[PDB]
Amino acid sequence: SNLIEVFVDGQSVMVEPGTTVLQACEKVGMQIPRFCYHERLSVAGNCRMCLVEIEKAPKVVAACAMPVMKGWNILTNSEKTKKAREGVMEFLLANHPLDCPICDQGGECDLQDQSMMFGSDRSRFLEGKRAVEDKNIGPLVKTIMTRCIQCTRCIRFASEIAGVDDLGTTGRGNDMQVGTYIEKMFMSELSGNIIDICPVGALTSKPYAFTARPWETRKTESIDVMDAVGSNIVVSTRTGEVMRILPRMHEDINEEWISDKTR
Amino acid sequence: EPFDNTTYKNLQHHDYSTYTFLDLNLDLSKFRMPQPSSGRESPRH
Amino acid sequence: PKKTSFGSLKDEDRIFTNLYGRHDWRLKGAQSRGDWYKTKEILLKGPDWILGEVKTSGLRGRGGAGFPTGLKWSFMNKPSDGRPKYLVVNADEGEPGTCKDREIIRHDPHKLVEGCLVGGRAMGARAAYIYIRGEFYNEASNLQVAIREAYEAGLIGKNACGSGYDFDVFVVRGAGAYICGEETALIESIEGKQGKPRLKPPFPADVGVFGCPTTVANVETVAVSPTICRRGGAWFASFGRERNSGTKLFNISGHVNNPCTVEEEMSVPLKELIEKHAGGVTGGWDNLLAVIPGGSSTPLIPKSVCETVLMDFDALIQAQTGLGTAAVIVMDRSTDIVKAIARLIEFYKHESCGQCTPCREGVDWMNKVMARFVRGDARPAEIDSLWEISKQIEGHTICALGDGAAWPVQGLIRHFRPELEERMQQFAQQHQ
Amino acid sequence: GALFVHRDTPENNPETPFDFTPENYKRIEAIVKNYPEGHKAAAVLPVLDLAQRQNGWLPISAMNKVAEILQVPPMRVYEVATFYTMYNRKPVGKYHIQVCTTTPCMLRNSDSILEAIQKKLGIKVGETTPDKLFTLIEVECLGACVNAPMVQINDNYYEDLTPKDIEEIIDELKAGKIPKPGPRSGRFSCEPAGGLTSLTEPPKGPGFGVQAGL
Numbered sequence: 046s047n048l049i050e051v052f053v054d055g056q057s058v059m060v061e062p063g064t065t066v067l068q069a070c071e072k073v074g075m076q077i078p079r080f081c082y083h084e085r086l087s088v089a090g091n092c093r094m095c096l097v098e099i100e101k102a103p104k105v106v107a108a109c110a111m112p113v114m115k116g117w118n119i120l121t122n123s124e125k126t127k128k129a130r131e132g133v134m135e136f137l138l139a140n141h142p143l144d145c146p147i148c149d150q151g152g153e154c155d156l157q158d159q160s161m162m163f164g165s166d167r168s169r170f171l172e173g174k175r176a177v178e179d180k181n182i183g184p185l186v187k188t189i190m191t192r193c194i195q196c197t198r199c200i201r202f203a204s205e206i207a208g209v210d211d212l213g214t215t216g217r218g219n220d221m222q223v224g225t226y227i228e229k230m231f232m233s234e235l236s237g238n239i240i241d242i243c244p245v246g247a248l249t250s251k252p253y254a255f256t257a258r259p260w261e262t263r264k265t266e267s268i269d270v271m272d273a274v275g276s277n278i279v280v281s282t283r284t285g286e287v288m289r290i291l292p293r294m295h296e297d298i299n300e301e302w303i304s305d306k307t308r
Numbered sequence: 309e310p311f312d313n314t315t316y317k318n319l320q321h322h323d324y325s326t327y328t329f330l331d332l333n334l335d336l337s338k339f340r341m342p343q344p345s346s347g348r349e350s351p352r353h
Numbered sequence: 354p355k356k357t358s359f360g361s362l363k364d365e366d367r368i369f370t371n372l373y374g375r376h377d378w379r380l381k382g383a384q385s386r387g388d389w390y391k392t393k394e395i396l397l398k399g400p401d402w403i404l405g406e407v408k409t410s411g412l413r414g415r416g417g418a419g420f421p422t423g424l425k426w427s428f429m430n431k432p433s434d435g436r437p438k439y440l441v442v443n444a445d446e447g448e449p450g451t452c453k454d455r456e457i458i459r460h461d462p463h464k465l466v467e468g469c470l471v472g473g474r475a476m477g478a479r480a481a482y483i484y485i486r487g488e489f490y491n492e493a494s495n496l497q498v499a500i501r502e503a504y505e506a507g508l509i510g511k512n513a514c515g516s517g518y519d520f521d522v523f524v525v526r527g528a529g530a531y532i533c534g535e536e537t538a539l540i541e542s543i544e545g546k547q548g549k550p551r552l553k554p555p556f557p558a559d560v561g562v563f564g565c566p567t568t569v570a571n572v573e574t575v576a577v578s579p580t581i582c583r584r585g586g587a588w589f590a591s592f593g594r595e596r597n598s599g600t601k602l603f604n605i606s607g608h609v610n611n612p613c614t615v616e617e618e619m620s621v622p623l624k625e626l627i628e629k630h631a632g633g634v635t636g637g638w639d640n641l642l643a644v645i646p647g648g649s650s651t652p653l654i655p656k657s658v659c660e661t662v663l664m665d666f667d668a669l670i671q672a673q674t675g676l677g678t679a680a681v682i683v684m685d686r687s688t689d690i691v692k693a694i695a696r697l698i699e700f701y702k703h704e705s706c707g708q709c710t711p712c713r714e715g716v717d718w719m720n721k722v723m724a725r726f727v728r729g730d731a732r733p734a735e736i737d738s739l740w741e742i743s744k745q746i747e748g749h750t751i752c753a754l755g756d757g758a759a760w761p762v763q764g765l766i767r768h769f770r771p772e773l774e775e776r777m778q779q780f781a782q783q784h785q
Numbered sequence: 786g787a788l789f790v791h792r793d794t795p796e797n798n799p800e801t802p803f804d805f806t807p808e809n810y811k812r813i814e815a816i817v818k819n820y821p822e823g824h825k826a827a828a829v830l831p832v833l834d835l836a837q838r839q840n841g842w843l844p845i846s847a848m849n850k851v852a853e854i855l856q857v858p859p860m861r862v863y864e865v866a867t868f869y870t871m872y873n874r875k876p877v878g879k880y881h882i883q884v885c886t887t888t889p890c891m892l893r894n895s896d897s898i899l900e901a902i903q904k905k906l907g908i909k910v911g912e913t914t915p916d917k918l919f920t921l922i923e924v925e926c927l928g929a930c931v932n933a934p935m936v937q938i939n940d941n942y943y944e945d946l947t948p949k950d951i952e953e954i955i956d957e958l959k960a961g962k963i964p965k966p967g968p969r970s971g972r973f974s975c976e977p978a979g980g981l982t983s984l985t986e987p988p989k990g991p992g993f994g995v996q997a998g999l
């Protein structure tokens with residue numbers, strides 16, 4: 046009825062009007078690269094890692110923000126698409142610090158993983174790097190903000206999910222910095238979820254700091270009992286010890302967040 | 309009335325001060341039409 | 354009688370008859386010069402007639418991109434939904450080398466205030482916000498005085514110009530940001546947020562300022578609309594080449610004898626413009642190194658191209674550049690072209706909003722590279738690296754500021770590559 | 786010095802006193818009414834600029850005042866203050882001198898203007914004179930490119946400068962007079978220095994060229 050037909054790599058898919066080019070690719074099984082897009086946050090379109098070619102169109106479109114149109118053929122593996130990804134990944138890593146050994150995100154980092162899969166294998170950056178000062182937003186979330194990639198997921202989450210307008214960007218240009226501006230704490234019953242949505246090690250768990258690595262944890266899918274909601278969780282263990290608690294997506298209960306008492 | 313094209317007639321702005329712009333906006337308010345309303349006092353309302 | 358040589362505009366056909374501030378900018382004189390004349394009769398013919406007049410004139414946007422104004426204004430001309438409609442007048446005026454809008458606002462303020470009313474009536478808007486940069490304080494106050502004079506005379510407000518159409522003109526001032534000249538980033542600044550451009554879609558004629566249908570138009574594009582409706586759509590198209598019609602304001606600056614603002618016909622040869630109105634290049638036409646034909650964003654062109662280049666949208670596109678704002682920047686052979694363009698990259702680095710990755714990181718990167726080329730502290734291989742770094746910024750950003758930082762670099766590499774490499778040898782020899 | 790995080794000081798803390806004067810509260814009322822009902826956040830920029838014209842700079846307490854009256858979250862007012870360069874977040878001198886050194890002003894020797902001012906006032910770019918009268922900084926294009934080189938002191942442009950025209954401007958400001966803005970050469974605005982090449986005839990009057998039925 047109201048469905049429109051679009052093609053993903055020449056393959057027909059029927060989508061509701063208003064579907065984004067990124068969501069059309071989901072239905073054929075293709076996951077577009079992303080950093081700023083989150084399905085449970087508002088669309089931003091600032092990282093530019095989802096840029097994709099549309100056949101017979103000269104300029105690439107941001108897949109996360111662009112609605113599809115009837116008859117569009119999305120080329121996700123095209124030469125124009127792949128070169129867009131290498132360029133953007135090249136910019137994202139230009140000022141990123143060489144911290145992977147000392148960074149808790151190492152081994153479960155979307156910057157590391159998407160660099161391996163869609164980025165170049167080497168650097169041609171021959172300049173100095175940006176160093177940003179760190180900000181104390183409380184006892185539960187550690188900030189190494191030199192690692193931030195300015196996706197504003199923390200900002201959009203804190204505004205829209207947690208109903209707290211304390212995070213924002215200050216300055217502009219290469220010196221635009223995420224934070225609170227003043228010395229303030231982002232203490233909320235849901236504050237600890239910015240750790241998960243931060244795709245990099247800019248925001249990490251202080252209690253969990255330095256203890257383990259992602260590859261060595263055993264995952265046990267269990268239930269939270271700190272309240273009567275019944276949040277689905279993952280218990281990470283290593284050598285018979287509980288290391289941390291993570292949310293497990295359950296749409297009809299906790300979605301993909303947990304409270305800080307659970308975490 | 310003479311077409312004297314030899315003087316700069318934009319000399320008024322040399323007397324403006326700190327609140328010239330916002331004072332004019334205050335006088336202009338009596339003329340504006342009623343503003344439209346979205347319906348709520350703010351998006352947070 | 355298709356005209357073949359364009360230029361030599363006569364003062365009868367000029368629009369900004371008070372461009373130089375030698376008459377009375379207040380309402381009394383402006384009415385003596387033909388402003389606010391039969392504005393009622395214009396507004397009673399309706400939104401269709403006015404738009405057709407603009408479409409016929411071949412008027413294209415005077416703010417940089419250069420889009421056909423009549424077609425652009427026609428998107429607003431649609432049935433309402435319940436939301437107000439607005440006209441945003443882009444008086445940010447921040448493109449380096451560009452200062453045409455400054456003169457309109459302070460010396461022909463009533464040409465703008467009428468264009469807001471005529472343009473607003475064409476699109477069906479209820480009011481016009483005029484965004485003006487916060488540095489232009491004296492110009493903003495002159496504009497406020499003119500808007501008061503028009504209000505007291507019944508020309509704008511309830512039953513404007515004795516027509517039954519209600520219209521307000523608001524003047525809002527910025528706070529320092531070249532990026533607020535970008536049409537969506539302007540809208541965001543009027544809403545009280547950081548001037549960060551929006552992605553499109555949705556287009557402003559769907560969801561604009563306050564979430565309402567909106568057209569953003571340049572000061573010069575709006576300030577000539579009442580005249581095109583008066584003297585006619587066909588009269589305007591009789592100037593300039595086909596598809597590049599009208600008379601244009603020109604800023605000549607740099608290494609000319611007499612830097613000046615002037616109005617001249619479109620398609621005027623660039624050599625004629627510099628010699629005739631600006632007094633020619635400092636030291637004669639043989640001292641000319643390169644010319645930036647329309648503000649910082651446009652690529653430079655070398656002296657060989659300047660000989661026979663016509664100043665219109667299509668001619669300058671052939672030369673791998675653009676008319677842009679028509680801000681002509683002149684550099685003579687004493688100029689350091691590398692240092693000249695490196696300072697533009699330092700400007701774009703300072704004006705990027707920081708929102709999106711290719712410009713937040715890419716423009717700052719190109720700035721660091723262009724700084725070393727100035728001292729020669731590089732290798733010839735980095736030049737093709739800098740070329741590819743720019744091509745990754747271009748077309749991959751949210752707004753066109755990212756484009757505007759790549760094009761200056763590409764122009765320097767395109768026409769002065771030997772100059773870049775030559776400096777690298779000297780640095781190597783000294784440090785050997 | 787271009788820091789975008791606030792650290793409380795005895796002179797700039799949340800309890801530092803700031804309140805709009807009763808006259809400036811009326812001006813805000815007209816500012817706010819320019820925008821649709823339900824979109825008061827549109828007034829953040831003008832109200833902050835008003836807070837800066839009353840105080841001369843924006844202390845953190847002034848920002849919280851703007852957030853309160855407009856009912857905007859304080860962070861969203863901190864973002865605007867840092868984003869726009871006209872807002873001063875440290876004390877600036879009575880006369881804030883801004884020299885455009887972008888390319889079109891650089892090609893007409895704006896460095897001579899910058900060197901002339903630095904030597905006269907005995908400061909370097911970004912500093913404030915010991916007695917607090919002057920603050921020198923560079924800036925980007927100020928939309929006065931044909932009249933380059935040019936500087937803005939407070940809200941006034943002084944254009945077509947020469948390294949002695951500016952040193953006269955500064956002498957007057959020290960004395961207490963405020964010199965008249967505009968070009969300091971023999972032209973009044975942007976016209977060609979050689980007495981006009983256009984618009985020399987008398988302007989035509991109403992009804993010239995009007996089409997058939999207009």
Ligand SMILES: Cc1cc2nc3c(=O)[nH]c(=O)nc-3n(C[C@H](O)[C@H](O)[C@H](O)COP(=O)(O)O)c2cc1C
Pocket residue numbers: 413414415416417418419420422425443444445446447448531532533534535536537569570571572574752753754757
């Ligand atoms: C960085 C940047 C700065 C801009 N500055 C201006 C400006 O100062 N004035 C202007 O009219 N358009 C400016 N533009 C272009 C506007 O986005 C838009 O194209 C224009 O206002 C539309 O009006 P027009 O159709 O009359 O050209 C700028 C664009 C960019 C990317």
Ligand code: SF4
Pocket residue numbers: 141142143144145146148149150151152154155156157192244245246247
């Ligand atoms: S955020 Fe990712 S890429 Fe950056 S240092 Fe940490 S693990 Fe490495």
Ligand code: SF4
Pocket residue numbers: 192193194195196197198199200223242243244245247248
């Ligand atoms: S702190 Fe993390 S989530 Fe927030 S903008 Fe930076 S990278 Fe994105």
Ligand code: SF4
Pocket residue numbers: 532549550704705706707708709710712713750751752753754755756
């Ligand atoms: S291209 Fe530059 S100015 Fe435009 S949105 Fe991206 S970062 Fe901001």
Ligand code: FES
Pocket residue numbers: 078079080081082089090091092093094095096107108109110
């Ligand atoms: S995921 Fe689309 S631009 Fe960030």
Ligand code: FES
Pocket residue numbers: 449450451885886887888889890891925926927928929930933935
């Ligand atoms: S370059 Fe200095 S005013 Fe434009």
Ligand SMILES: [K+]
Pocket residue numbers: 150239240241242243244245246247248249
């Ligand atoms: K994280």
